[PDB]
Ligand binder design. Structure first.
Ligand SMILES: Cc1ccc(NC(=O)c2ccc(CN3CCN(C)CC3)cc2)cc1Nc1nccc(-c2cccnc2)n1
Length: 279
């Protein structure tokens, strides 16, 4: 679709927001991208000189997925792309608060309120519901892949090539790659099965991050055969400090050993809605 093409001369590139071995996301300003706001801040994803054909394909593939998914309030939204006479650029909206983990850390003292945490929980479920409805499996759902926009609107994202998986402790080496094992369903780690149901397990881990104000899952527990054995044995985390007992129950239901026993994202949205004063 060429409806998304944006002239390169209308895009000003700024500071780096995220970077990996082969890709990066940078801050930007787009002129004429919008009739309403002719001077608009944006985020731009692009390859680095170090990248090869395999990565170029991946970026193009990512853009296709993005063009194909429709827009949703809770997914970072595509605004345009630069695909001619140059390296590909994917342009999205800019999220004022940045990633959720850093935001939560910055706000421990203010704690931002518990209702805010519940809203985040509700919004993520709605975004995931949207992705699931499109038969799209995320595979890396975590607070580090949740952005927060103005008005405290969560925006689910996937850094992808823009994440240094090799130097990030959250990702563990496996079969010539690194995986966020502490966030993955057992059937994913051990049986290479990825489904909307395995995303639900990650969502549970995400809720633990939210209600620990950005703590590390399985704190002090390194990833090894013992950790793997504990997970397979049905071991689950304790309740984080700021979680209520209903929020903890939700996490536990997301961590069921049997994927079919996990609630749907649509169901999760309704259960969380029942915890909110607002109807
Ligand atoms: C600029 C850009 C380009 C592409 C994307 N793409 C995605 O966020 C994304 C989300 C979901 C999918 C779906 N996909 C399904 C298949 N599985 C395996 C992967 C996920 C794909 C891409 C985001 C962005 N935006 C982005 N990315 C990282 C950080 C920021 C950012 C950072 C700070 C402040 N404001 C914005 N902004």
């Amino acid at each position: 679709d060429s409806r998304w093409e944006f002239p390169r001369d209308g895009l000003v590139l700024g500071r780096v927001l995220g970077s990996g071995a082969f890709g990066k996301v940078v801050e930007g300003t787009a002129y004429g991208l919008s009739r309403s706001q002719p001077v608009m801040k944006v985020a731009v994803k692009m390859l680095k000189p170090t990248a090869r054909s395999s990565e170029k394909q991946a970026l193009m593939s990512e853009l296709k997925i993005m063009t194909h998914l429709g827009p949703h309030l809770n997914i970072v939204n595509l605004l345009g792309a630069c695909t001619k006479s140059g390296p590909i650029y994917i342009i999205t909206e800019y999220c004022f608060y940045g990633d959720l983990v850093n935001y939560l850390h910055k706000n421990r003292d203010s704690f931002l309120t518990l209702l805010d945490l519940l809203s985040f929980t509700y919004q993520v479920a709605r975004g995931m519901e949207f992705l699931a409805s499109k038969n799209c499996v995320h595979r890396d759902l975590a607070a580090r892949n949740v952005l927060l926009a103005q008005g405290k609107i969560v925006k689910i994202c996937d850094f992808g090539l823009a994440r240094d998986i090799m130097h990030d402790s959250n990702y563990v080496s496996k079969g010539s790659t690194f995986l966020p094992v502490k966030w993955m369903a057992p059937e994913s780690i051990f049986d290479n099965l990825y489904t909307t149901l395995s995303d639900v397990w990650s969502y549970g881990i995400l809720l633990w991050e939210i209600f620990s104000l950005g703590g590390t899952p399985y704190p002090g527990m390194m990833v090894d055969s013992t950790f793997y054995n504990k997970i397979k044995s049905g071991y689950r985390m304790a309740k984080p400090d700021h979680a209520t007992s209903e929020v903890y129950e939700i996490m536990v239901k997301c961590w069921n050993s049997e994927p079919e026993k996990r609630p749907s994202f649509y169901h999760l949205s309704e259960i969380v809605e029942n915890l909110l004063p607002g109807q």
